[PDB]
Design a protein around this ligand. Structure first.
Ligand SMILES: CCCCCCCCCCCCCCCCCC(=O)OC[C@H](COP(=O)([O-])OCC(O)COP(=O)([O-])OC[C@@H](COC(=O)CCCCCCCCCCCCCCCCC)OC(=O)CCCCCCCCCCCCCCCCC)OC(=O)CCCCCCCCCCCCCCCCC
Ligand SMILES: CCCCCCCC/C=C/CCCCCCCC(=O)O[C@H](COC(=O)CCCCCCCCCCC)COP(=O)(O)OCCN
Lengths: 53, 115
C-alpha cells in the first residue's frame, strides 16, 4: 500500500477527479447531444419533392 | 335611399354556422429551387396579430419605416429607409416590400424581395 502511494502520490486526487469528470460528462454528453439534434432537426425532418413539367 | 333599395332587393336573402377555426402558424420553409428562372423570389413572415388587434397600427408604423423599394425608385442612396438606401447602393435587389397581411386572429408580418 505504501509502495503504491510512493509510486503514485496522486492516486486519491486523480480518483476524485475521475468521479467529477464522469459526473460532468453525464450531464454534458446528453445535453450537447440534444443541442445537436435540435439544430439538425431542420434537416432530419425535411421532405424532398421533384416536380418537372 | 340606399337602405330602401337594400330592403327592396336583398331582403329575400337568408339569415338562418360556418365559423372560423383558429389557424395554427408554423415556423417552416418551402423552397422551390428552379435555377432556370432569372431572378429569385423570397417571402418571409412571422405570425401577425390579426384584423382586430391595436398592434396593427404600431406594426404599420414600423413597416413604413423599413419601407418598399424598386429599381425605378428615384431616391436611391439618399433614401430614408436604411434597407432601401443599402439595397440601392449595393444593388442587393430589384425590389422589396414589407407587408402586414391580416386575417381573423392571425396574419403574415414580413417582407418579400426579388433579387
Ligand atoms: C477503443 C477506442 C475507440 C475508438 C475511437 C476513439 C476516438 C476518440 C473519440 C472520438 C469520437 C468520434 C465520434 C464523433 C461523433 C460526433 C457526434 C456525431 O456526429 O453524431 C453522434 C452520432 C450519431 O448522432 P445521431 O444524431 O444519433 O445520428 C443518428 C443517425 O442519423 C442514425 O439514426 P438512427 O435513428 O438509425 O439511430 C438510432 C439510435 C437509437 O439507437 C440506440 O442505440 C438507442 C439507445 C440510446 C441510448 C440512450 C440515449 C441518450 C439520450 C437520448 C434520450 C431519448 O442510435 C443512435 O443515435 C446512434 C448514436 C449512439 C447512441 C446513443 C448513445 C448510447 C449510450 C447508452 C447510455 C444509456 C444511458 C442514457 C442516460 C444519460 C445520462 C447519464 O452518435 C454517436 O456517435 C454517439 C454520441 C452521442 C452520445 C451521447 C448520449 C449520452 C450517453 C450517456 C452519457 C454518460 C456519461 C458518463 C457516465 C455518467 C455518470 C453520472
Ligand atoms: C481556453 C480554455 C480551455 C478549457 C477547455 C474546456 C473544456 C470543455 C469540456 C469539459 C469536459 C467536462 C468534464 C470536466 C470535468 C471537470 C470536473 C472537475 O472539476 O475536475 C477538476 C479536474 O477536472 C479536469 O481537469 C478535467 C478537465 C478536462 C478538460 C480537458 C480538455 C482540454 C485540454 C486542456 C489542455 C491544455 C478539478 O476538481 P477538484 O480538484 O475537485 O477541484 C474542486 C473544484 N474547483
Amino acid at each position: 500500500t505504501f509502495l503504491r502511494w510512493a509510486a503514485e502520490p496522486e492516486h486519491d486526487h486523480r480518483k476524485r477527479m475521475g468521479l467529477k469528470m464522469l459526473l460532468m460528462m453525464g450531464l454534458l454528453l446528453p445535453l450537447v447531444y440534444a443541442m445537436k439534434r435540435h439544430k439538425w432537426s431542420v434537416l432530419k425532418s425535411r421532405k424532398l419533392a421533384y416536380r418537372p413539367p | 335611399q340606399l337602405l330602401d333599395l337594400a330592403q327592396k332587393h336583398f331582403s329575400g336573402l337568408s339569415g338562418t354556422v360556418p365559423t372560423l377555426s383558429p389557424c395554427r402558424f408554423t415556423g417552416s420553409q418551402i423552397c422551390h429551387r428552379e435555377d432556370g428562372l432569372p431572378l429569385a423570389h423570397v417571402a418571409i413572415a412571422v405570425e401577425g396579430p390579426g384584423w382586430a388587434h391595436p398592434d396593427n397600427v404600431a406594426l404599420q408604423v414600423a413597416n413604413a419605416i423599413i419601407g418598399h423599394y424598386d429599381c425605378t425608385y428615384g431616391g436611391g442612396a439618399h433614401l430614408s429607409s436604411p434597407l432601401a438606401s443599402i439595397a440601392a447602393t449595393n444593388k442587393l435587389c430589384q425590389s422589396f416590400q414589407t407587408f402586414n397581411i391580416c386575417y381573423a386572429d392571425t396574419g403574415l408580418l414580413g417582407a418579400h424581395f426579388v433579387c
